[PDB]
Structures are given as C-alpha cells and as structure tokens.
Enzyme design. Structure first.
Site, PDB file in Angstrom:
ATOM      1  N   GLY A  15       0.819  -1.197   0.000  1.00 27.51           N
ATOM      2  CA  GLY A  15       0.000   0.000   0.000  1.00 27.51           C
ATOM      3  C   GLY A  15       0.857   1.253   0.000  1.00 27.51           C
ATOM      4  O   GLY A  15       2.081   1.197   0.100  1.00 27.51           O
ATOM      5  N   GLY A  17       0.052   5.307   1.630  1.00 29.76           N
ATOM      6  CA  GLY A  17      -0.879   6.171   2.325  1.00 29.76           C
ATOM      7  C   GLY A  17      -0.344   7.600   2.382  1.00 29.76           C
ATOM      8  O   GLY A  17       0.584   8.006   1.671  1.00 29.76           O
ATOM      9  N   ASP A  90      -8.276  -5.382   2.061  1.00 25.44           N
ATOM     10  CA  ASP A  90      -9.319  -4.396   2.307  1.00 25.44           C
ATOM     11  C   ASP A  90     -10.630  -4.810   1.638  1.00 25.44           C
ATOM     12  O   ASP A  90     -10.653  -5.677   0.763  1.00 25.44           O
ATOM     13  CB  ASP A  90      -8.886  -3.003   1.902  1.00 25.44           C
ATOM     14  CG  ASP A  90      -8.660  -2.825   0.417  1.00 25.44           C
ATOM     15  OD1 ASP A  90      -9.631  -2.862  -0.352  1.00 25.44           O
ATOM     16  OD2 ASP A  90      -7.508  -2.659   0.048  1.00 25.44           O
ATOM     17  N   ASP A 131     -13.435   9.112   7.359  1.00 27.71           N
ATOM     18  CA  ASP A 131     -13.021   8.615   6.066  1.00 27.71           C
ATOM     19  C   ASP A 131     -13.385   7.147   5.924  1.00 27.71           C
ATOM     20  O   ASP A 131     -12.577   6.359   5.407  1.00 27.71           O
ATOM     21  CB  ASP A 131     -11.541   8.837   5.771  1.00 27.71           C
ATOM     22  CG  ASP A 131     -11.239   8.865   4.282  1.00 27.71           C
ATOM     23  OD1 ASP A 131     -12.196   9.053   3.481  1.00 27.71           O
ATOM     24  OD2 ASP A 131     -10.080   8.632   3.931  1.00 27.71           O
TER      25      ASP A 131
END
Ligand SMILES: O=C(O)c1ccc(Br)cc1O
Ligand SMILES: O=C(O)c1ccc(Br)cc1O
Ligand SMILES: O=C(O)c1ccc(Br)cc1O
Ligand SMILES: O=C(O)c1ccc(Br)cc1O
Ligand SMILES: O=C(O)c1ccc(Br)cc1O
Ligand SMILES: O=C(O)c1ccc(Br)cc1O
EC number: 2.7.11.22
Lengths: 300, 262
Positions: A15, A17, A90, A131
């Site tokens: 990932g 971020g 996810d 979020d």
C-alpha cells in the site's frame, strides 16, 4: 515504544498512504506479521505531520477488536515507523474478488455488525473517523473486519465545534457536509457506513458523484430532495439553493432491490437526511437485521 | 441534539474522567525543578494566552498546551532559558492536534523573537512527543465545561464566558490548581460563574452526572473565589485583557461576589 527496526524483516509493499508506503513485515523474534507505515520526517519541514499526531494519539486509546491495532511507534531522528497488526485485504479488493458471486448475506451482516461495533467504540471515545470507505476497512482470514486509516480522524468535544470542512471521500460524504453546515457530528460516520452497507450488497458505490454538486444531486435523486418537513433547517444551510431540482423520494425497495425488509429498514435509518434522526452505531447494533448474525470466515 | 451526541455523551464523560487521572501532572513537580518556579510558569502560560489571542487559536488549544507542559515538566528537568522552548513546542503540538489551520512552524519561531532556531523548535517537538509517548488527547477544563453548559436552564452566554475565564485563570497558578482535576476546576468555575451572573447554584442534574456536590467542590471553589477576587492585582493580566473582548461578552469586567454562602 518497545521496538527496533533490526528485529523486522521486510516482506513486500502492501500500500501507500498519506505518509508514503506501507510494508508487510515480519518480527523475526516472535514471528508476528505487521504492517509498517513509514512517516518520513526528514522530508518534513513542519516537523511531525498533524495527520500522524492525530493518527497515533487517537489509535493509542482505541483498543477494540474492530479497530486496527497500533502495536508500537519506533522513533528515529529522521524517521517514524508506525507498527500495526497485519490484515490480509481491504473490503474494496474483497468486493472486486467477489465480482459475480456476490458477498453472501451472512458475511455482509457479520461485517456490518462488526463495523458498527468498531464505530460505536470510536464515538464512545470522542473520536470521529471521517473517512469510512471500503479501502479503509481491513479483513482477515478469521472473519474479522476492522476500521483502519485514522489519518483523517479527530477528537471531538461535546457539543461539537466547527471542524475541517470537506472531510470524507466524496462518494461516502454526508449531505450536511455537502451543504456546508457549520456543525457535523457522529452522524457523518453512520452515513458512510450506510453507503458501505448498500455497496456490500450491490458491489457498486451507491452515490458515485464526480463533483460536490453531482454528489448531492445523486443523493437527492435516490432519497428525494429534502425539504423542511424531512429535514428542518435544510433550506437555510449555507450551500442550500432554492433552485435545487425537487426529486421525489423513490421507494427504498428500488434503491437496493435484493435487500429484505429488515435490511431496508436499517439502511433507511443510516441514510436519514436529518443528522438528528439518523441512527447511532450504538442503537443500530439492536436492529432486527442482526437477529441471526454470526461471524463466518471470508469465502475466498 | 446530534451535535450534543445524546447516545454517547455519558460514555464520553465517563471516559474523560478516567483519562484525566491518567493525564494528570505531578502535583509537586515544581519543588523538584532546580532552576524554574511557579512564577516563571505563570509568565509562560500568560505568554501562551497572548500567542493564542495573536493567532486566533481555540481556547482548547491553550488548555492542551498547558497540559503538555505540566506533564513534560513532571519528568524533565529544564533550565529557565529553555522553558520557553518547551512552551513553544507544546503550543505547536496542541495546534496541530486541535486546529483546522495551525500556524506554520516559522510563526512559532517568530513569536519567540529568534531566541530559538526552527531546528530547536522541531527538536523539542520530537522530545515532547517522546516524553508524552504521543498521549495528546488529554481532557481539558473546557471539555468538561462545554458538557456542563448543556445543563443551564436556559443557556446564558455570560455564564459560559465567565466560566471559561475562570478556568483559564486556573492555568496560570500551578499552586494551588495542579492539585485539582480538570473536571473539578470546571465544576467550580461553572458554579462560580452561575452564582456571579444569575445567583443560581451547581444544579442537581450535574450532581447526577458528575457525582460532585458543593461539599466536594468546596476546597477548589474557595481557591477559585480568591483567584477571581485577586485577579485585577495578579502580575499576569493577559486573560483579563482577552476576556474584555466582546467575543467573550466582556466578562472580565463583571464584579466577583464578595461572598459565596457555601
Ligand atoms: O528492516 C528495515 O530496515 C526496514 C525499513 C523500512 C521498513 Br517500511 C521496514 C523495514 O523492515
Ligand atoms: O492505515 C492503517 O491503519 C493500516 C493498518 C494495517 C494495514 Br495491513 C494497512 C493499513 O493501511
Ligand atoms: O459549484 C458548482 O459547480 C455548481 C454547479 C451547479 C449548481 Br446548481 C451548483 C453549484 O454549486
Ligand atoms: O527568568 C525568568 O524569570 C523567566 C520566566 C519565564 C520564562 Br518562560 C523564562 C524565564 O527566563
Ligand atoms: O526573561 C524573561 O523574563 C522572560 C519573560 C517571558 C518569557 Br515567555 C520568556 C522570558 O525569558
Ligand atoms: O511514542 C511511543 O513510545 C509509543 C509507543 C507505543 C505506541 Br502504540 C504508540 C506510541 O506513540
């Protein structure tokens, strides 16, 4: 805290971020698999980012099975390493992987119940997530789903003060934010979870807008344009316009056709216009929809 | 009522009550500080008040900063020439936590009159985060006050503003205030503000919520009542000046009551 980077073995990138890249790593002494989030402070001229200050301070106090666990923060003079528990996937990737199967209802119901438990815990600890979207919800092989990415979270006071406008990824953003309201509260997180509920059932976003105004118009066309009756004060709101088209409210049976009566009831209460009438995560836990809830492992 | 989170306000209150004990500074820290004093802390806090006014920071930010300073000073011995560096880094951290728009680091360097470098401020920021182990979501006097304000029958702006001034006054004077919890100073300030303005008392409803009575608040109330009477003469004046402003209903201009009958 009690950590050092020599005891970690990098496995692969997983990932990227707000701070750079997340790696899967392995603790070479314990065997524990973790996610590392590197926060470069050497490339920081304003020192530690406020995003990280909130993420760390808030996650320290949120100990709950449906909130991702911050295990440690490793402090170097130029670098900051956030050590989280590792989760495999996810919810967005899981939904795409479930493309033409569908997600079985027992799993949707289990996931929504857990998300509500996690969110109720946030709200009981003066924390707004701000979020919630499927990319920020992590699942493991044992059936758990957890709130993650607290990079936009904030500690609230009671009553709430004015906070940052234009929080929440657009497709998951509540009408009161879109209308520029002076105040928003815990109801914004429920709105997001409502969109997520619908999305788990259909595998597509409920309100995929391209703009703030298109987002609002999409909502209005599904739920009906709100008036003073459904939502007192709406016509006064800063970015309310009397010229707004007035769409009729469609039957929720047509908003998410596969949903049963209970599901529809709950969805409707999550997506109530009026933030005051919208259901709380705490109260939602008791909805008849969850009567037969279990916690099965994911099917894939 | 969602802005007042009906489904969570009791859980939140309970949680803040637990956290305030964990975030409490050492009551006697200043005796173990060789080179700084209650008086220098008073000067620092008073300065932080001005900085907050200058940059239009929330009150909550000021309160967080003071919390950070007293907890750091509880475990870190500091020379007087570095007290202001701790304070600046504390205000910076509080601003990034609590503000929509924190001032830039350069502005924090600027307000110190180039006493310190940008590098020193940032190095101190890390030091403070390390000593506090990122425990920054501390309960303040303000977080309790805003909940207590919900118990007014009906709401009164002067009561609210006067309670905030009184709580702010307590930040200045580590003796005696370090010995009281945020929730208890907030209770004293709220009762004292309510009494001054409307003649009314700490309500039954807040007894239900907090467990505190005028009995349990008495010691703090006697301290706060004296601070209020003496406030025009105190060496530090920034809070009185601030609370002359109409934003706060000019409450610093109200006369303290001569007696409490408590
Ligand atoms: O082992 C290292 O030195 C290391 C460095 C960065 C990251 Br992200 C993970 C690591 O494991
Ligand atoms: O942001 C987080 O909290 C997070 C935690 C664990 C993993 Br795996 C990915 C993440 O993004
Ligand atoms: O901001 C826009 O671009 C916009 C466009 C159309 C309408 Br109706 C309202 C708007 O605010
Ligand atoms: O010397 C003093 O009395 C003094 C007082 C407050 C601060 Br902050 C720094 C100081 O050096
Ligand atoms: O030297 C002083 O007396 C002084 C006063 C206020 C501040 Br803030 C810093 C100081 O160093
Ligand atoms: O700063 C620290 O030492 C620390 C330790 C553990 C955790 Br979880 C978060 C932290 O921030």
């Amino acid at each position: 805290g009690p950590g050092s980077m020599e005891n970690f073995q990098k496995v692969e990138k997983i990932g990227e971020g707000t701070y750079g890249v997340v790696y899967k790593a392995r603790n070479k002494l314990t065997g524990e698999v973790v996610a590392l989030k590197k926060i470069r402070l050497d490339t920081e001229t304003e020192g530690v980012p406020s995003t990280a200050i909130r993420e760390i301070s808030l996650l320290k106090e949120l100990n709950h099975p449906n909130i991702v666990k911050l295990l440690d923060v490793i402090h170097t003079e130029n670098k900051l390493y956030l050590v989280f528990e590792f989760l495999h996937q996810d919810l967005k990737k899981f939904m795409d992987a479930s493309a033409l199967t569908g997600i079985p209802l027992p799993l949707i119901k289990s996931y929504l119940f857990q998300l509500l438990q996690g969110l109720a815990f946030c709200h009981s600890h003066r924390v707004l997530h701000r979020d919630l979207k499927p990319q920020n919800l992590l699942i493991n092989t044992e059936g758990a789903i957890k709130l993650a990415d607290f990079g936009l979270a904030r500690a609230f006071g009671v009553p709430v003060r004015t906070y940052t406008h234009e929080v929440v990824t657009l497709w998951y953003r509540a009408p009161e934010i879109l209308l520029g309201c002076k105040y928003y509260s815990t109801a914004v997180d429920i709105w997001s979870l409502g969109c997520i509920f619908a999305e788990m059932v259909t595998r597509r976003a409920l309100f995929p807008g391209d703009s703030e105004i298109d987002q609002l118009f999409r909502i209005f066309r599904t739920l009906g344009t709100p008036d003073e009756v459904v939502w007192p004060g709406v016509t006064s709101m800063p970015d309310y316009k009397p010229s707004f088209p007035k769409w009729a409210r469609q039957d929720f049976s047509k908003v998410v056709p596969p949903l049963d009566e209970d599901g529809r009831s709950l969805l409707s209460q999550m997506l109530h216009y009026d933030p005051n009438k919208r259901i709380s995560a705490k109260a939602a836990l008791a909805h008849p929809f969850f009567q037969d809830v279990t916690k099965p492992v994911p099917h894939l | 009522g969602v802005n007042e989170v009906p489904d969570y306000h009791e859980d939140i209150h309970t949680y803040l009550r637990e956290m305030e004990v964990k975030c409490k500074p050492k009551v006697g820290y200043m005796k173990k500080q060789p080179d700084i004093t209650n008086s220098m802390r008073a000067i620092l806090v008073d300065w932080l008040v001005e900085v907050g006014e200058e940059y239009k920071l929330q009150n909550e930010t000021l309160h967080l900063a003071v919390n950070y300073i007293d907890r750091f000073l509880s475990s870190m011995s500091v020379l007087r020439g570095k007290l202001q560096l701790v304070g600046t880094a504390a205000m910076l951290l509080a601003s990034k936590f609590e503000e929509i728009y924190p001032p830039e680091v350069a502005e924090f360097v600027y307000i110190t009159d180039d006493t310190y470098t940008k590098k020193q401020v940032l190095r101190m920021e890390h030091l403070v985060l390390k000593v506090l182990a990122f425990d920054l979501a501390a309960p303040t006097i303000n977080q309790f006050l805003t909940q207590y304000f919900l118990h007014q029958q009906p709401a009164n702006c002067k009561v609210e503003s006067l309670a905030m001034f009184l709580g702010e006054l307590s930040l200045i004077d580590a003796d005696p205030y370090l010995k009281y919890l945020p929730s208890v100073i907030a209770a004293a300030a709220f009762h004292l503000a309510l009494y001054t303005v409307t003649g009314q008392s700490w309500p039954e409803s807040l007894v239900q919520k907090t467990g505190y009575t005028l009995e349990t608040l008495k010691p703090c109330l006697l301290d706060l009542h004296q601070t209020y009477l003496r406030a025009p003469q105190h060496a530090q004046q920034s809070i009185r000046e601030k609370y002359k402003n109409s934003k706060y209903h000019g409450v610093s201009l109200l006369n303290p009551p001569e007696t409490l009958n408590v």
